[PDB]
Design a protein around this ligand. Sequence first.
Ligand SMILES: CC(C)[C@H](Nc1ncnc2[nH]c(C(=O)N[C@H]3CCN(C)C3)cc12)c1ccc2c(c1)S(=O)(=O)CCC2
Length: 167
Amino acid sequence: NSFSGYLKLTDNVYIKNADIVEEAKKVKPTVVVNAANVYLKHGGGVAGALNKATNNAMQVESDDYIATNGPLKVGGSCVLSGHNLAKHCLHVVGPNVNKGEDIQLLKSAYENFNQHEVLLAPLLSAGIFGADPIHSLRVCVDTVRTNVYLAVFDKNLYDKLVSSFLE
Ligand SMILES: CC(C)[C@H](Nc1ncnc2[nH]c(C(=O)N[C@H]3CCN(C)C3)cc12)c1ccc2c(c1)S(=O)(=O)CCC2
């Protein structure tokens, strides 16, 4: 958990303009959060980047979890191996508002972070999941009580998020 170069927003929420994959390799955190879908199909975006960094071992392990346990629910999670990225991967399903899922489930999604003392995470439901990223940060700050280090791989969005929080 050797996080560096983060800006502390609240006593438990830190933020950096960084690629979560590169952060995971440098930091070696106890937990890395994946922005998953309910069938754990890591086809693109953040989930595809983390799977590629494990040389597809994450996808094979995820298919075996799904065969035995069935899909997750939107707002839910599961803990699987972190492989070379972390001790554990917390797969969390935030709502995909571009597909009509309820934005209120973003609170349930962040609530899953509270079962882990320290986590490296992306901004849930942002990007192609369609949520307003400034609203996602507000829900994170209001809901997560354990220590969360957010990696946001876009300087333009990082600057808008920091400006919005410090208003
Ligand atoms: C909003 C954007 C900036 C954000 N994207 C990111 N944030 C953090 N770390 C990121 N890594 C990457 C990435 O592609 N790394 C590669 C690039 C080469 N490298 C060796 C690995 C993107 C990343 C973001 C956050 C959440 C969500 C999305 C996108 S999504 O569209 O995948 C839908 C799910 C939710």
